[PDB]
Design a protein around this ligand. Structure first.
Ligand SMILES: [Br-]
Ligand SMILES: [Br-]
Ligand SMILES: [Br-]
Ligand SMILES: [Br-]
Ligand SMILES: [Br-]
Ligand SMILES: [Br-]
Ligand SMILES: [Br-]
Ligand SMILES: [Br-]
Ligand SMILES: [Br-]
Ligand SMILES: [Br-]
Ligand SMILES: [Br-]
Ligand SMILES: [Br-]
Ligand SMILES: [Br-]
Ligand SMILES: [Br-]
Ligand SMILES: [Br-]
Ligand SMILES: [Br-]
Ligand SMILES: [Br-]
Ligand SMILES: [Br-]
Ligand SMILES: [Lu+3]
Ligand SMILES: [Lu+3]
Lengths: 225, 223, 224, 222, 223, 224
C-alpha cells in the first residue's frame, strides 16, 4: 500500500535500509526549523526529516506585499548530528567545517506497517506477536533549544527510537551560516518506570557521564509480517 | 498492521472491537511539558497510550553529558475520568481513579473520524462502518499558553464522552495531579447555517445546555 | 483499502479528485486555528483541513466550572485563500463578502497511500519508482500570523505541496466575523539549494514579484 | 512626586488633604497587542487613563497603514467589587466594573514596604503612613500574558486582597468579562524569622486566605 | 537630580529642553532580544541612550564560565531616522547603517518631568505650575520578530515621541545586518470622544496622509 | 530617595556613603508564575526581601481559591560564590542558605543613576555627581523555559559589583534550587568607537578572559 520508514545514521555515512525494506533515496537528517521565532519540526520517522540537500537556511519567507526574503533575518534550522566533537575553541562552526557534523538518512519503502514500541525499562521491548524487528534504540520524545522552542516525536513512530543515545543528538544552525552546540540544547527521553512505582512520587536522580544511557527507556522498531 | 486506539475516559481498559487483537493497554497520555514547552501525542495514534503511568515519565539531558530526572519543574497531562474535581491535589495512589485508560488494537484497515459541525451525527463514507460516535474535540490549553490539539481526521478528535475538562494536570516531581482553573478544552461548534457562517453570534452556555452545542463525529473503518 | 487524500483548489471552485481516487466530500480549506493564544493546525494533506462548514469561529471553549463561551473573546481561524484581490480600502471583510476569499477542498479515497517529494531546486522531483503522479506544486513548510503564532506541514505529506504558489496563501479571520490579510502574515517555503552552496554561508536574497516562484522548491504528490 | 490612588469602585478617589489632583480616570492594568502584554505600574500616573475604551490604542506597520479596532487586541483594567457577571457586559453596562483613579501632586516620594508576615510592616523612620494593604505581585490572563507590580511601588500594595482584581475587555467587541484563566499572585506570609527553605503546599478557600498573604504599607517621607 | 532623556529621531544630536542641562549624548536603544527574549529600555530613561552603537551591544555567559559574543541569533532594536529602505529592500550593513539610527540626549532637570496625553487630536496642557519641554505623539508599545517587544510608561517622557512615524524603529542582528520588516508594529494611544468611551469602538483603517491626524497627542512637562 | 545594594555573598552589604540603612534582606532577581516571568529591578527595594523562600508567593483563581506551592512555579535569586555541589543535584532546605545573596535598602539624600562605558574603562560620573560604586554592566537573563527579565540601564541594578558568569540560582516551589545549563546572563559588551558601524566580530571567551570583555559601569549620586 506504500508504507515508508525513515532511518537516521547519526553519522556522515548513509544508513542501510532495515531488513525487508528497499531504498528510495538518501539525504540529511532535519530535526526542525524556526522561523519568526516559531519552531516547526518533522517527525524523524517520516520522509520529511530527510532532505536531499542540506543548508543552514533551508527555507525562505514571503509577505503579503509579494516580497520574499532568504537568509535575511535571524532564523534557525536544526539537524541530527554526528559524533564529531566541538572544536576546542567552542566557537560556531562555519562553511565546509559543518559537513562532518550533519547526520545522514534513508527513506525506505516497506511491505507493511512499521511502528515503534517502548519498554520504559532498560530492557529491549519485544515486538508485538507477528511483527519482525527493524532496529532497536533509545526512547527519544522531544527537544528544545533557542527560546525553549522545539518539537518532538510520536511515540509509536520509528522516529521516537534513536539507535544511538547522545546527550546532544542535534546541532543548531543559523541563516548567517553558523552552527554550534549550546548549553540549552535539551534532549528529552522516556524514563525507566518500575510498574510498582507508577503511582508513587518520582525519586529524583542526577546522572553523569557513564551512567546516562543506563537509565533511559529502550525501544524497538517493528514491521508487520 | 494498522492500529486502532481507543481511550475509555474511565478507569477501566477499553475493549478492542471483536476480531481485533489487543497489542496492549495503558494510560491516556495527552502531552508532556518540558521547559514549559508542550509536546503532544495524537490521541488517535498508539503513542498516546503509555503502558506505564507516572507523574514524570520522562527525563532530559544537556550537551554537557548530564541528565536530570524529576529534578526541576516539568509536568505531564493525561485524559481524565468522571472522578469528582478534588478540593486539593491528589497524591500517588489517589491519582489512579482520575486517569483515563486506553487500548491499542491491531485493525484490518485504517480508521478515520468525520465531523458534522452540526447537532446531527455525520455518516461514515459509503462503504465504511461506524466504530463509535462522539463529540468533536479540537484542542486544549492549560499552564501558560501551552497545550495542543487533535487531528480532525484522527479518531483522537472524536471522544465518546463530552467533558468541559477532559484532562488532568500532573505536577511531575511533586507526584500529584490536579485540576486548575486555567484548563480549557476546545470543541468544534454546531453551526446553525447549512455551510457558511460569516457572522458568529456570541453566546455563553451553562451546564445542561452544552452538549447540543457541540459538533458531533463518528469514527469509521472501511468495510 | 481506503486511504484519504485531500486536495485544495486555492480558488472558489471545488478541486477535482486526481485520477485513481474517488470523491467523498467537498469543503473549505482550514489552515489552522488560534485559541487562548495557542495555534493549532490541521495538516493540509489530511481531511482535517477540509471542513464541510465555514465559519470565522468554528469552535468554542469550556472551563472547569462547566461553562462554555462561544465567539466572545479574541480567538482566530485561518483559511487557505483564493486569488481574490484584497479590498482597496484594506479594511476587514465581513459576512457573506468573505466567501470569495475562501479556498475550497476535496477529500478523496485512494487505493494506496500518498506522499510528497521535494527537489529543493526548480526541477519537478520525480515520483519514486512504483509510484504515480497525482499533482505537482511548491514546497510549503510553515506560516505565522497574529502574535507570531502559526503551524506547519509535514514535508512527507501532500499538504506540503501546494499547486499554486502564493506569497499570501492564507487569510486571517476573527470570532468577531471579520477577516483580512495583515502585514505580519508570513508564508515559509523550502528554498532552492544549489549543491555547492549546501556547506557555505547562504547568500542572502530579497525577491520581488516576478522572481518569486522561480526560487521556491518544487514538489510532486505521488501515489503507490 | 505623583501619588496615584485607585478606588476599585466606580467612584473617583479623593486626593490626600494637602494634595492637588491633576486628573482622574480609569485604572489601566495593561494592553495586549499581538498577544503581547504591555503593563502600566499601578503606582505610576500612566496607570490612570482619563478616557476609557475597550480599545484605547491603534497600531501601524511600516507600510504606512494603521488599524484601529480592526483586529483582535484587548485591554485589561483594575476592576471594582461588582459581582462577577454571568455573561460579558457591553458598552454602558461596563461602567460599574472599571476601577477609577486619581493622580495627586504630592510633597515627597511614596514607597511601599512588605512584611511577608501577618504583621504590618512599619514605615521607615521619618516617613508617614498613607495606607496599609496586601502584597499584590503579578497576574496572568489570556495565554501566558500578564504582568506584575514593583514591590517598592505603591501599586504593589492594594488596600485589600482580591482573588480577581482585574477585568478583560475584548477590544473591538466592546465588551468586558471575567474569564476562568485569570490569576492574581501575592507575596505570602512566612512564619520563620527570615529563612524558609521547604514550603508546605496548601489550598486555601475563602475565609482562610488573608492570613497567608503578606501585608504592606505605603509611606511618604516626613 | 532628576533626569530626562530626549530622542532626535535623526542623525543630529537632540538638544536638552529649555531649563535642563546636558550630561551626554548617544544612540537611541529601544530594546534587545536575547535567546528569543525581549527586554526594553524606557525611552524616557538614560538606559535608552547608549554612548556606543553596535548591531550587537551585548553578549551572554553560561554556568560553565564561557561567554559568547555575536555568536548565536540575537537582536537589537534602535529608534530610527527618516532614512528609507534602499530600493533593493535588502538588509543594510556596516557604515550604511549609520544614517538610520536616532541620536539621544540625557539631561539633568531641576524638578520632576512627566508626560500627559490628551487621547484626542488636541495637545494636552501641562498641569498647573508645570512648564513645557516638548510635545509629540502618544507612543505606547511595539512588537517585531516573534511578536516580542516592549513599551513605554504612559507618564514617562518616552511615551511622547516628537515626530510620528509608522515605523519608528529599525531591527538589527548580531550578524551585522539591520532592516525594516513588515511585522514591525508601533502602537499608539487612539483619540477617544468622551461620549464614545463606553460604546463599541468604530473600526478604522488609515492610510498615508491620514495617520498623524488620528493619533493621541502628548506633552512632556517639568515642575 | 532609595538605593538598593547587593553583596552577592552571604554577608549583608553596607549602605554606600551618604546613605542610611532601612533594612537588610535577600536578593530576589525574579519570579515565574504560570510560566510568566516577572522581575524586580535590582536597583529597587523590590529586589530585596526581608524573608527568603523558594516559593515567596501564591496564586488565586476566579473561584476565590488560592493555591500555594502546589504547582510548578519558580523564584530566582542572586547567588554567592558558593561552589555548586559536585553531585550537581538540587540543593534543599537549610543547605540553600549559603547560595543566596544578601541586600541592603538605603535612604539617599539625592537621586542615583548608573552610567556605562561599553569599554574596559570606567565611565566617569556626570559633573556634579559622586561615585557610590563601580561594576559590570548587567542587562538581562533567562532560565527555565527561556523566560527571564532584565535591568534598566539607568538604574544601579544594571551595575553589579562582582561579575559572575552565573549570577543567579533557580529555585522551585518544591523547595529545590540549582544551577541549570540554560541559565544565561547577558551583559553589555565592549565596543571600540572605530568599530561601532562594522560587522561585530564573533567571539567565544573562556574563564580568565571574561571580565576583560564586559562593559564597565559606575553608580553615581547627584551630590557634592
Ligand atoms: Br535568516
Ligand atoms: Br552556550
Ligand atoms: Br552513558
Ligand atoms: Br521535573
Ligand atoms: Br487554580
Ligand atoms: Br472569539
Ligand atoms: Br497589519
Ligand atoms: Br513570481
Ligand atoms: Br482590535
Ligand atoms: Br523598613
Ligand atoms: Br472562561
Ligand atoms: Br480570607
Ligand atoms: Br548574535
Ligand atoms: Br518582511
Ligand atoms: Br569581579
Ligand atoms: Br509551586
Ligand atoms: Br540543565
Ligand atoms: Br575573567
Ligand atoms: Lu508558552
Ligand atoms: Lu505569550
Amino acid at each position: 500500500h506504500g508504507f515508508l520508514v525513515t532511518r537516521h545514521s547519526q553519522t556522515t555515512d548513509d544508513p542501510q535500509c532495515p531488513p525487508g525494506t528497499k531504498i528510495l533515496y538518501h539525504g540529511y537528517s532535519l530535526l526542525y526549523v524556526q522561523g519568526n521565532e516559531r519552531a516547526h519540526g518533522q517527525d524523524l520517522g517520516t520522509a520529511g526529516s530527510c532532505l536531499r540537500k542540506f543548508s543552514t537556511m533551508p527555507f525562505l519567507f514571503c509577505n503579503i506585499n509579494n516580497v520574499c526574503n532568504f537568509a535575511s533575518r535571524n532564523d534557525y534550522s536544526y539537524w541530527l548530528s554526528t559524533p564529531e566533537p566541538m572544536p576546542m575553541s567552542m566557537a560556531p562552526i562555519t562553511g565546509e567545517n559543518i559537513r562532518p557534523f550533519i547526520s545522514r538518512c534513508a527513506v525506505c519503502e516497506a511491505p507493511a506497517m512499521v511502528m515503534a514500541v517502548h519498554s520504559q525499562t532498560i530492557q529491549i521491548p519485544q515486538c508485538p506477536t507477528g511483527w519482525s524487528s527493524l532496529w532497536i534504540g533509545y526512547s527519544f520524545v522531544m527537544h528544545t533549544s533557542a527560546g525553549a522552542e522545539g518539537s518532538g516525536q510520536a511515540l509509536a513512530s520509528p522516529g521516537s527510537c534513536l539507535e544511538e543515545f547522545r546527550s546532544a543528538p542535534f546541532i543548531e544552525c543559523h541563516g548567517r551560516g553558523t552552527c554550534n552546540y549550546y548549553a540549552n540544547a535539551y534532549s528529552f527521553w522516556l524514563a525507566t518506570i518500575e510498574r510498582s512505582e507508577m503511582f508513587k512520587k518520582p525519586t529524583p536522580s542526577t546522572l553523569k557521564a557513564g551512567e546516562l544511557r543506563t537509565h533511559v527507556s529502550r525501544c524497538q522498531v517493528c514491521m508487520r509480517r | 498492521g494498522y492500529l486502532l486506539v481507543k481511550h475509555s475516559q474511565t478507569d477501566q481498559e477499553p475493549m478492542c472491537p471483536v476480531g481485533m487483537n489487543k497489542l496492549w493497554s495503558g494510560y491516556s497520555l495527552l502531552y508532556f511539558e518540558g521547559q514549559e514547552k508542550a509536546h503532544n501525542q495524537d490521541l488517535g495514534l498508539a503513542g498516546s497510550c503509555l503502558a506505564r503511568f507516572s507523574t514524570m515519565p520522562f527525563l532530559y539531558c544537556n550537551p554537557g553529558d548530564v541528565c536530570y530526572y524529576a529534578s526541576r519543574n516539568d509536568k505531564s497531562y493525561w485524559l481524565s475520568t468522571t472522578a469528582p474535581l478534588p478540593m486539593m491535589p491528589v497524591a500517588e495512589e489517589d491519582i489512579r481513579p482520575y486517569i483515563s485508560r486506553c487500548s491499542v488494537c491491531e485493525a484490518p484497515a485504517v480508521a478515520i473520524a468525520v465531523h458534522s459541525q452540526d447537532v446531527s451525527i455525520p455518516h461514515c463514507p459509503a462503504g465504511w462502518r461506524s466504530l463509535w460516535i462522539g463529540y468533536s474535540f479540537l484542542m486544549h490549553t492549560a499552564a501558560g499558553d501551552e497545550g495542543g490539539g487533535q487531528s480532525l481526521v484522527s479518531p483522537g478528535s472524536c471522544l465518546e464522552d463530552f467533558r468541559a475538562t477532559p484532562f488532568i494536570e500532573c505536577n511531575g516531581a511533586r507526584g500529584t495531579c490536579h485540576y486548575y482553573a486555567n484548563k480549557y478544552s476546545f470543541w468544534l461548534t454546531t453551526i446553525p447555517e447549512q455551510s457558511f457562517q460569516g457572522t458568529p453570534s456570541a453566546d455563553t452556555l451553562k451546564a445542561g445546555l452544552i452538549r447540543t452545542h457541540i459538533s458531533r463525529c463518528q469514527v469509521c473503518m472501511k468495510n
